[PDB]
């Protein structure tokens, strides 16, 4: 799951859990069933708490809760999906965390590879510190200044995979997909891109993140496909209007691109997928 999916999951999470009271949280399996996450004990000790928001910045999602009584006692659940982590409203395979709300309302977090993380915190300054570790959200921010890519003498791949340098939220398939549209070889240094390519890249980044966010599901998140098709969508990047109704991988994990051209499973700074036949260093 990348930026777009995390944001859509937060949307769905607020839709059903915003305003609800979190009664209990249980890690029944995985990397935390052995030794619970940081701040876990101090957390279930302040429960019950009301959920006031479920927000994201890039690939980082967090719950914001407040003590019914002492509203100055604010709590937060830091969370990252990782390669296979997904939220759901029914107990799915590899469920790792189980959240119990009032009126027997349940919410689950599955994660086959166990790359997702949790952390409970009672500090708001610690949140701001975390959110400050991420560059602007490539999907929610409609006016990032992609121009600073020139100042860096490093691969365009690395620059987009980075979560702080230019913006946050792009991952393995978004970068690969975006670069394929801009027809830019992933090896091309940010310092070698032309003002043209730059404003061209800023276009596909917006285009791809919006299309991804607008998709019912991507591959994972299929556990929320019924909720996803029943919830609207925020107008991020309100001027770029993707044409396809669903997000389709053109190069990601594809032996050949659409037109047949070969797609190399290159592996520069996991594997980045690109079609040398269409992506140029020019």
């Amino acid at each position: 799951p990348e930026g777009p999916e995390v944001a859509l999951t937060a949307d769905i999470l607020e839709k059903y859990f915003k305003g609800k009271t979190l009664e209990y949280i249980d890690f029944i399996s995985g990397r935390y069933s052995k030794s619970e996450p940081e701040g876990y004990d101090d957390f279930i000790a302040n429960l019950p708490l009301k959920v006031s928001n479920v927000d994201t910045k890039g690939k980082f999602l967090w719950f914001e809760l407040f003590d019914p009584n002492d509203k100055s006692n604010k709590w937060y659940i830091w969370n990252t999906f990782g390669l296979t982590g997904m939220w759901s409203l029914f107990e799915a395979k590899y469920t790792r965390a189980v959240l119990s709300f009032d009126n027997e309302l349940m919410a689950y977090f599955s994660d086959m590879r166990n790359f997702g993380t949790f952390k409970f915190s009672n500090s708001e300054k610690e949140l701001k510190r975390k959110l400050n570790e991420l560059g602007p959200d490539f999907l929610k921010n409609d006016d990032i200044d992609i121009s600073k890519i020139k100042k860096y003498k490093q691969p365009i791949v690395a620059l987009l995979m980075d979560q702080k340098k230019i913006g946050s939220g792009l991952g393995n398939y978004l970068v690969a997909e975006i670069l394929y549209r801009a027809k830019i070889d992933p090896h091309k240094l940010g310092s070698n891109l032309t003002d043209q390519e730059i404003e061209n890249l800023w276009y596909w980044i917006k285009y791809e993140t919006k299309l991804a966010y607008d998709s019912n599901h991507i591959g994972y998140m299929v556990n929320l496909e019924n909720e996803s098709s029943k919830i609207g969508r925020k107008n991020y990047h309100p001027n770029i209007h993707p044409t396809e109704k669903e997000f389709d991988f053109l190069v990601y994990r594809k032996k050949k691109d659409p037109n047949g051209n070969k797609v190399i499973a290159d592996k520069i700074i996991r594997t980045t997928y690109w079609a040398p036949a269409i992506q140029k260093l020019e």
Side-chain angles (χ1 to χ4, degrees):
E2 289 175 27
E5 297 126 78
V6 176
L8 177 61
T9 297
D11 283 8
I12 296 171
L13 250 33
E14 284 209 326
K15 172 167 177 170
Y16 295 97
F17 304 104
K18 168 141 182 178
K20 297 282 158 40
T21 310
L22 173 62
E23 317 252 50
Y24 203 57
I25 171 78
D26 196 15
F27 292 91
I28 75 176
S29 164
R31 70 141 79 200
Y32 290 122
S33 65
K34 295 284 73 68
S35 52
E36 273 82 60
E38 187 195 309
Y40 178 84
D41 281 318
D42 197 42
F43 183 78
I44 63 179
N46 299 221
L47 251 45
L49 299 173
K50 289 264 286 189
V51 179
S52 80
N53 288 124
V54 182
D55 204 319
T56 68
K57 204 209 181 186
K59 302 176 198 162
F60 177 75
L61 174 154
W62 79 82
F63 281 75
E64 187 179 307
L65 305 89
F66 69 92
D67 183 345
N69 307 142
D70 179 9
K71 192 155 181 171
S72 80
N73 184 34
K74 297 183 176 179
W75 278 86
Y76 310 87
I77 308 178
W78 294 12
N79 178 48
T80 64
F81 299 11
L83 281 70
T84 56
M86 57 197 301
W87 283 89
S88 69
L89 271 51
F90 71 92
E91 187 170 351
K93 195 174 177 185
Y94 319 94
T95 291
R96 305 307 185 203
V98 180
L99 292 69
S100 307
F101 297 80
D102 51 276
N103 289 95
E104 277 63 48
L105 180 57
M106 311 296 304
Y108 313 76
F109 179 79
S110 300
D111 194 352
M112 184 194 97
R113 294 234 51 185
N114 300 296
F115 287 137
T117 69
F118 277 87
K119 173 174 173 167
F120 306 85
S121 173
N122 197 181
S123 179
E124 174 175 0
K125 290 178 178 181
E126 197 190 5
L127 208 229
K128 283 191 184 65
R129 175 223 89 194
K130 181 67 175 192
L131 265 44
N132 214 292
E133 279 175 38
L134 302 178
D137 192 287
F138 269 143
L139 186 258
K140 304 158 93 170
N141 195 181
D142 196 9
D143 40 67
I144 296 176
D145 206 2
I146 174 181
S147 48
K148 59 156 67 181
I149 294 181
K150 287 175 169 294
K151 309 296 184 180
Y152 295 81
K153 285 168 56 197
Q154 44 195 184
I156 190 64
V157 193
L159 297 172
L160 293 181
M161 296 297 272
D162 190 282
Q163 299 307 303
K164 175 59 174 180
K165 282 164 181 171
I166 292 72
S168 61
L170 271 36
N172 224 51
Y173 81 83
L174 279 181
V175 162
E177 292 302 307
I178 292 176
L179 298 182
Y180 179 72
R181 301 267 190 168
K183 288 167 295 178
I184 302 177
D185 174 359
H187 306 287
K188 228 272 188 61
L189 281 57
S191 56
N192 295 307
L193 266 59
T194 68
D195 303 59
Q196 195 75 287
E197 298 168 299
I198 255 53
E199 59 173 48
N200 202 70
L201 186 51
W202 176 228
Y203 173 81
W204 292 108
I205 280 173
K206 290 192 279 181
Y207 190 99
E208 294 297 272
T209 52
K210 187 173 186 176
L211 180 59
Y213 172 67
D214 289 342
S215 296
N216 169 289
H217 61 308
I218 298 300
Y220 260 158
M221 245 218 110
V222 58
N223 281 171
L224 283 174
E225 87 192 314
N226 296 124
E227 293 74 34
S228 171
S229 72
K230 264 149 53 196
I231 192 174
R233 222 122 307 189
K234 300 177 178 176
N235 202 19
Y236 294 124
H237 296 156
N239 294 152
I240 285 55
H241 308 291
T243 254
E244 39 289 74
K245 29 65 271 301
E246 207 68 300
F247 191 102
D248 274 301
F249 295 132
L250 303 187
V251 168
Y252 184 64
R253 287 180 176 166
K254 296 291 185 181
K255 57 165 62 191
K256 303 161 166 290
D257 81 330
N259 296 188
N261 312 62
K262 185 189 188 298
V263 174
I264 164 185
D266 205 349
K267 191 171 302 172
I268 58 288
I269 200 290
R270 56 173 285 201
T271 137
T272 303
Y273 294 86
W274 65 297
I278 287 74
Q279 287 160 289
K280 306 302 179 185
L281 304 65
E282 194 58 62

